[PDB]
Amino acid sequence: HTEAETIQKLCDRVASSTLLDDRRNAVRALKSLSKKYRLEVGIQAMEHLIHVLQTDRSDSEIIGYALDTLYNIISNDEEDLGSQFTEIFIKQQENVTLLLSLLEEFDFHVRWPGVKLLTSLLKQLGPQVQQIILVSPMGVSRLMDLLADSREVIRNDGVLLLQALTRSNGAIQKIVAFENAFERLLDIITEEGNSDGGIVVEDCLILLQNLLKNNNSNQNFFKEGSYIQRMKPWFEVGDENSGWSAQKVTNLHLMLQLVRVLVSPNNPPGATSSCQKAMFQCGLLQQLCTILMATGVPADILTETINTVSEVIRGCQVNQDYFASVNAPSNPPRPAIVVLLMSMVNERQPFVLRCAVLYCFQCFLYKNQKGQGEIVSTLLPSTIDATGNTVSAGQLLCGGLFSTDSLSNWCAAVALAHALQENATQKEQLLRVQLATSIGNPPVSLLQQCTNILSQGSKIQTRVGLLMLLCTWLSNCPIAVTHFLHNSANVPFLTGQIAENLGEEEQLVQGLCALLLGISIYFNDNSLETYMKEKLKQLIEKRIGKENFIEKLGFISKHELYSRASQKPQPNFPSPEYMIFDHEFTKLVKELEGVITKAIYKSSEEDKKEEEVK
Amino acid sequence: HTEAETIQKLCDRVASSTLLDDRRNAVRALKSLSKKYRLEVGIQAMEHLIHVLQTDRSDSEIIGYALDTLYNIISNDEEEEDLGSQFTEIFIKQQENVTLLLSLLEEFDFHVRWPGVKLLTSLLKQLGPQVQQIILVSPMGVSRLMDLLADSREVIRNDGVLLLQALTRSNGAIQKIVAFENAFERLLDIITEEGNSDGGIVVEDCLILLQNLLKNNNSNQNFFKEGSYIQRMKPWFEVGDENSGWSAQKVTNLHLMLQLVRVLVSPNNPPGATSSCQKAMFQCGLLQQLCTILMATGVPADILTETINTVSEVIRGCQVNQDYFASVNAPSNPPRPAIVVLLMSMVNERQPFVLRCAVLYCFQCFLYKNQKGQGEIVSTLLPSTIDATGNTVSAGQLLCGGLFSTDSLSNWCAAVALAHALQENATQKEQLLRVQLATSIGNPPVSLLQQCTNILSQGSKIQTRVGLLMLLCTWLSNCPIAVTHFLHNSANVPFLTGQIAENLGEEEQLVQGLCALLLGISIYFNDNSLETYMKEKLKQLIEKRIGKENFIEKLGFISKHELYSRASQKPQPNFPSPEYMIFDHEFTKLVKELEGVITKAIYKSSEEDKKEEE
């Protein structure tokens, strides 16, 4: 009965006794038992503790202890009982709005544990408790007053409460922004010394990400409110004095994240465009770029600053044109793009950096036909000649394309593919590129050499890279398709690969050969005699079987790695073995998989009608 | 010099010297220094070692010394997955060097043939596509190599099985020849001779070689079956009843035997092939023998699991085989029909994850294209026709039980099992609407349809909700009457629009996209019988409260989820641990089927919808 009925007796007191002192004492006893006998105190004490909160409001002290005891029952912040009791506490709507009332009180011993309790509830039944507060009249606004509390333990734990209130809840994120959240949280971060400001800067950065991430209205306010310029001082860093703390790197990671959130490729493209421009004009883009010249910067901060710059420029000419204008101070001063490509094909750089550098290269080229022409024309040199050395973009791409490192081959092929992407003009130009073979042997075009590599016992990653280039190059480009089929070795290589009984490690390659062949049909103009289109269909029927051809084509989208690649532009590869798919390439596969599939069926009698009907 | 000229004198000696005995010792010297200074011994001895083989054939002592050395230079068999492939390249640069090796294998002498076989096997492991094509083109190369299986010296035959593995890997042409040359009979006899699964490494190797000949090779599969070889598998699974003590090698051998059965009934085969084999397997009693294993004792966990997966494919889509499996019972405590034993283990929190996935696959294979079976599951949820002797759990009870369990695995499995009872069966989709669940004394029934939906707002685990929505989507697709029953409850449409419009975090975006698909299905298969939520009202609500392009982004999260492509590959559930149990294979096809058309149905206008309503 003692350690069991003992609690029952303390409960009789709180319920039954008329002297505030007797009740108060008994709640303080429970406050201490609450830790070691969490289950027992909760099952018996809870109804009673709430009654105290309802009826003993003149005695701040006893309230402070009812709350302390409740926190102790409900909280899993230490670590089941947490949600079990949270469900019981909240099943009466009014128990939470009561809690709201109690936080309007100034007494440290009432408000602090109130804050901590409500936070524990919001992290355990978020949606439910957020909804109770949202519908309460001005419930969210009043909780916002906790940021005006001069006391620090209260204000700081108040930020943590707003994290929990705001999480996954767009209506609340808007109200919180309405109530001056941005100005006030940026001021706290400014006052704590930006990235140097310890734990509280982190929880304010976390809270800001809750407010902006995928929340279009708040992002727009953030921009219209001119709050982007407040981001600029965060990145006046690096410099030197290279003992950065764990907390500083952590804080600056969260800061780079907020910038990227505002220029996310998944946003409505107007909003990202607007923020890109806003970033070029307050100097934020240019500041970040400076982080990348400095010494002292930790590698992973370097790595994410590159990924951030990438998205600040993506598809925005002034910002792309700017980025290219920058030059690193070095014996050869080297343009920015040249510098990215050197790191991308450097076997000695970490994988994570090599992927950031590629992404940056790709964002540079996106919707940028001038930049796309500038890359391609360095492979057709004319009005540049020997100064006694110098190293060019196209030289680095070729060096990577035919290198011994499958990572370099893959990166060089995808980087080239982004130079051709939605640019027929440059696909025609790249067909002009000729490679020297040996002293006194004819040259081989870049097109044919990329194709030759697929039959030479190359690693599967090299072959995947190259076939993506090849598919991108021929797609939507009939003279590409003409030049390709013109070499008689190519259609038989493809048909033999597609027909072969290849093991599972080679089936992605097999499927990409299906797509390339099918591109050479769909985008065929019939201008070449001996591989028209109907010839090619019948060759598929004869050698592979139409159904089998389509099955193999279907391997591309069923590859275990495809889906993930389709989610966003940034390379998302946990390690080298996962570098297989490119994001824009997954889009090409979706646009064409279906139209090739009909194209390929539909018989000859239909086809001469179809080649009369168009 | 005194380390590398100690090589070149010998080379000079092998070439220069005119006495056989002198050259022979020159070569014997070199051999014993081969697997020791590989690099240098390879870089200059190789052209002379070949010359030797190419002329000194009357003396088979020096030939085996030449072959041994050459194996020590080329082989990487020591190294357990460099110089190996550097020298294989050099060696095969002369087409004829390989065909000269094939000539040496015809020699009976043990000291020539055995290094010959090991050397040719190493070349094939290291550059298979090249070496395989050399051998295939030469006058009856493959055919001659088959003779090695007929060698009465075990060592040579056993290592000849390995050569045939490397010769046939990934090569459909060589696979055909080896089959035509009586490979099946001759490997099935070896297996029978060495005593089936108890026949050690030799049987493991013949099982791999059979797998090479059968997997994804339709012509070879068709020949395996027409030639009555399926009945040669039956003895392999007379794996007698009791106390265990199975060796590691016995379990390996059985795993590979089970894999061969599955090869023949693969869902990835043309359906005819698979169907014909399934029949063939019932007729010779193979299905029955595999089912006997499931009842036995002392059967290791892993062989049990894989037998379940094997039986699954044997019965999948074959009515007679499905009827047979259904009619088997355990004797257990009282009886228990097979289906019920599967379902009990599926909903058993203490069964292994892999075992729980196996029984699910089995159940799904029992229902596939089996409308009768689908009917019998669903009719048990309508318990009419049946009363109790107290005890006797049914299929339905266990499915409902699991569907409301606390364990999310059981919820997902119960919901998926249930979705397979409805597939392509409008009749049962309409019958399941009749199911009414009891709540509590004096209170209204809650239908199963609506109760499945309720769970989605009740703070359930993500896995629980993913399962339930796959079920709801399957249930409503092509069932206008189920779309009516769903919409009719007024809380359902506001709940979905709410979920889709909310700023949910990444861990919940699959559920959000599934809510969109659900909402889209109730628009696409609406017949306008329900005035409150007609087709056109719903299209407008989407615009109002979420935005159409937004709705499609959400709808698009399903195919983009990282685990989606993998699930789309094959029928068997493919989950490395419990957290990965997310998508059902057949559901992924529903998504491919409806997304383009839903997307297209949503956009249009209203004016056009008058004429789509026309």
Point out the residue among B171, B503, B565 whose CB comes nearest to the CB of A557: B565
Point out the residue among A168, A457, A567 whose CB comes nearest to the CB of B503: A168
Q: Are A457 and B171 within 8 A, CB to CB? A: no
Would you give the DSSP letter of residue B446? E
Q: Are A501 and B171 within 8 A, CB to CB? A: yes
Point out the residue among B217, B505, B560 whose CB comes nearest to the CB of A501: B217
Residues of B in contact with A557 (CB under 8 A): 565, 568
Q: Are B561 and A563 within 8 A, CB to CB? A: yes
Would you give the DSSP letter of residue B127? S
Q: Using CA atoms, how far apart are residues A325 and A335, in angstroms rounded to an integer?
A: 7
Q: How far is CA A594 from CA A116, A550, A584, B218, B596, in A?
A: 56, 10, 17, 26, 11
Least Cα separation, residue B220 to chain A (angstroms): 12
Task: Give me the helix-helix angle, B548-560 and B535-545, nearest 10°.
Answer: 90
Q: Are B169 and A503 within 8 A, CB to CB? A: yes
Point out the residue among A214, A499, A503 whose CB comes nearest to the CB of B170: A503
Residues of B in contact with A506 (CB under 8 A): 170
Q: Tokens 């998508």 belong to which residue?
A: B583
Point out the residue among A125, A502, A562 whose CB comes nearest to the CB of B170: A502
Residues of A in contact with B133 (CB under 8 A): none
Q: Are B127 and A457 within 8 A, CB to CB? A: yes
**Which residues on chain A place their C-beta less than 8 Å from a C-beta of chain B?**
125, 127-128, 167-170, 173, 213-215, 457, 499-503, 506, 557-564, 566-567
Q: Tokens 């090991």 belong to which residue?
A: B118
The greatest distance separating any two alpha carbons of chain B, rounded to the nearest whole angstrom, comes to: 111
Which amino acid belongs to residue B28? Answer: R
Q: Are B171 and A500 within 8 A, CB to CB? A: yes
In sequence order, the β-bridge partners of residue B446 are: B437
- Technique employed here was X-ray
Q: Using CA atoms, how far apart are residues B416 and B468, in angstroms rounded to an integer?
A: 8
User: Is-contact A128 A110, C-beta < 8 A?
Assistant: no
Return the closest-CA partner of residue A130 out of A167, A102, A95: A167
Task: Give me the helix-helix angle, A336-344 and A393-401, nearest 10°.
Answer: 10
Q: Using CA atoms, how far apart are residues B573 and B577, in angstroms rounded to an integer?
A: 11
Q: Using CA atoms, how far apart are residues A473 and B558, in angstroms rounded to an integer?
A: 30
Which conformational region is residue A27 in: left (phi greater than 0), alpha (psi within -120 to 50 degrees), or beta?
alpha
Q: Are B459 and A125 within 8 A, CB to CB? A: yes
Looking only at the bridges linking them, the beta strands covering A434-435 and A444-445 are antiparallel
Which conformational region is residue B606 in: left (phi greater than 0), alpha (psi within -120 to 50 degrees), or beta?
left
Phi/psi at B436 (5° precision) = -120, 135
User: What angle (nearest 5°) sits at the alpha carbon of residue B63, between those of residues B60 and B69?
Assistant: 145
Point out the residue among B502, B508, B564 whose CB comes nearest to the CB of A170: B502
The burial of B458, by beta-carbon neighbours within 10 Å (0-12 exposed, 13-18 middle, 19 or more buried), is given as: exposed
Q: Using CA atoms, how far apart are residues A135 and A158, in angstroms rounded to an integer?
A: 20
Task: Give me the helix-helix angle, A216-224 and A170-178, nearest 10°.
Answer: 20
DSSP three-state, residue B421: helix
User: Is-contact B519 B486, C-beta < 8 A?
Assistant: no
Q: Using CA atoms, how far apart are residues A10 and A21, in angstroms rounded to an integer?
A: 13
Q: How far is CA A269 from CA A216, A454, A590, in A?
A: 11, 38, 21
Phi/psi at B447 (5° precision) = -60, 160
Which conformational region is residue A243 in: left (phi greater than 0), alpha (psi within -120 to 50 degrees), or beta?
beta
Scanning every residue of chain B, which has its alpha carbon at the shortest distance from the alpha carbon of A499?
Answer: B172
User: Is-contact B254 B239, C-beta < 8 A?
Assistant: yes
Scanning every residue of chain B, which has its alpha carbon at the shortest distance from the alpha carbon of A166?
Answer: B503
Q: How far is CA B544 from CA A325, B439, B501, B540, in A?
A: 46, 36, 10, 6
Q: Using CA atoms, how far apart are residues A163 and A169, in angstroms rounded to an integer?
A: 10
Least Cα separation, residue A556 to chain B (angstroms): 9
Least Cα separation, residue A604 to chain B (angstroms): 25
Return the closest-CA partner of residue B174 out of B143, B150, B210, B216: B143
User: Is-contact B417 B346, C-beta < 8 A?
Assistant: yes
In order, the DSSP letters of B564-585 are HHHHTT-SS---SSGGGTT--H
Q: Which tokens belong to A188?
A: 């706290």
Residues of B in contact with A125 (CB under 8 A): 459
Dihedral over Cα of A38, A44, A49, A54: its sign: positive
Q: Are B459 and A562 within 8 A, CB to CB? A: no
Q: Are A503 and B568 within 8 A, CB to CB? A: no
Q: Using CA atoms, how far apart are residues B23 and B518, in angstroms rounded to an integer?
A: 82
- H or E element, residue A19: none
Q: What is the 3-state secondary structure (H, E, C) of B285-316?
A: CHHHHHHHHHHCCCCCHHHHHHHHHHHHHHHC
User: What angle (nearest 5°) sits at the alpha carbon of residue A174, between those of residues A168 and A176?
Assistant: 90
User: Is-contact B565 B523, C-beta < 8 A?
Assistant: no
Mutate which of B131, B565, B588 to disrupt the A interface (most A C-beta within 10 Å)?
B565
Would you give the DSSP letter of residue A434? E
User: Is-contact B504 A168, C-beta < 8 A?
Assistant: yes
Residues of B in contact with A563 (CB under 8 A): 559-566
User: What angle (nearest 5°) sits at the alpha carbon of residue A207, between those of residues B550 and A237?
Assistant: 110
Scanning every residue of chain A, which has its alpha carbon at the shortest distance from the alpha carbon of B570?
Answer: A558
End-to-end CA distance of chain B: 95
Least Cα separation, residue B503 to chain A (angstroms): 5
Which amino acid belongs to residue B343? Answer: L
Scanning every residue of chain B, which has its alpha carbon at the shortest distance from the alpha carbon of A211?
Answer: B503
- H or E element, residue A102: helix A94-102
- H or E element, residue A24: helix A20-36
Q: Using CA atoms, how far apart are residues B337 and B4, in angstroms rounded to an integer?
A: 76
Least Cα separation, residue B459 to chain A (angstroms): 8
Q: Using CA atoms, how far apart are residues B555 and B580, in angstroms rounded to an integer?
A: 21
Q: Are A562 and B563 within 8 A, CB to CB? A: no
User: Is-contact A446 A433, C-beta < 8 A?
Assistant: yes
- H or E element, residue B219: helix B218-226
Q: Using CA atoms, how far apart are residues A596 and A593, in angstroms rounded to an integer?
A: 6
Dihedral over Cα of B331, B334, B337, B338: its sign: negative
Residues 6+ apart with CB under 8 A from B226: none
Q: Using CA atoms, how far apart are residues A323 and A336, in angstroms rounded to an integer?
A: 7
Q: Which tokens belong to A181?
A: 């959240």
Q: Tokens 């089998």 belong to which residue?
A: A548
- H or E element, residue B463: helix B462-476
Least Cα separation, residue B168 to chain A (angstroms): 10
Point out the residue among A127, A128, A215 whose CB comes nearest to the CB of B503: A215
Distance of CA A402 to the CA centre of its chain: 31
DSSP three-state, residue B64: helix
Point out the residue among B172, B459, B505 whose CB comes nearest to the CB of A500: B172
Residues of B in contact with A212 (CB under 8 A): none
Cite the DSSP H helix spans in B105-199.
Answer: 110-126, 128-137, 141-145, 154-168, 172-180, 183-193
Least Cα separation, residue A484 to chain B (angstroms): 24
Q: Using CA atoms, how far apart are residues A102 and A96, in angstroms rounded to an integer?
A: 10
Q: Which tokens belong to B367?
A: 């229902």
Residues of A in contact with B127 (CB under 8 A): 457
Q: Tell me the count of A-B CB pairs closer than 8 A.
A: 60
Phi/psi at A126 (5° precision) = -40, -75
Point out the residue among A167, A501, A563 whose CB comes nearest to the CB of B172: A501
Which conformational region is residue A241 in: left (phi greater than 0), alpha (psi within -120 to 50 degrees), or beta?
left
Cite the DSSP H helix spans in B347-439.
Answer: 353-367, 371-381, 395-403, 408-422, 426-431
Distance of CA B371 to the CA centre of its chain: 26
Q: Which CATH architecture has domain B1-614?
A: Alpha Horseshoe (1.25)
Q: Are A457 and B566 within 8 A, CB to CB? A: no
The count of residues in chain B is 614
Scanning every residue of chain A, which has its alpha carbon at the shortest distance from the alpha carbon of B172?
Answer: A501
Which conformational region is residue A457 in: left (phi greater than 0), alpha (psi within -120 to 50 degrees), or beta?
left
Q: Are B562 and A563 within 8 A, CB to CB? A: yes
- Gyration radius from chain B CA atoms: 32
Q: How far is CA B73 from CA B28, B39, B91, B135, in A?
A: 14, 8, 10, 22
Return the closest-CA partner of residue A515 out of A430, A599, A420: A599
Residues of A in contact with B564 (CB under 8 A): 563
Q: Which tokens belong to A591?
A: 């646009």
DSSP three-state, residue A57: coil
Scanning every residue of chain B, which has its alpha carbon at the shortest distance from the alpha carbon of A171?
Answer: B502
User: What angle (nearest 5°) sits at the alpha carbon of residue A462, between those of residues A456 and A465?
Assistant: 125
- H or E element, residue B488: helix B480-488
Q: Are B217 and A502 within 8 A, CB to CB? A: no
Half-sphere exposure of B607 (CA within 13 A, CB side): 0
Q: Are A168 and B505 within 8 A, CB to CB? A: yes
The strand ranges marked E within B402-519 are 436-437, 446-447
Least Cα separation, residue B380 to chain A (angstroms): 34
Q: Which tokens belong to A91?
A: 């099943």
Q: Are A168 and B563 within 8 A, CB to CB? A: no
User: What angle (nearest 5°) sits at the alpha carbon of residue A134, between those of residues A128 and A139?
Assistant: 120
Which conformational region is residue B392 in: left (phi greater than 0), alpha (psi within -120 to 50 degrees), or beta?
left
Q: Tokens 């005891």 belong to which residue?
A: A69
Least Cα separation, residue A226 to chain B (angstroms): 24
Q: What is the resolution of this structure in A?
A: 2.2
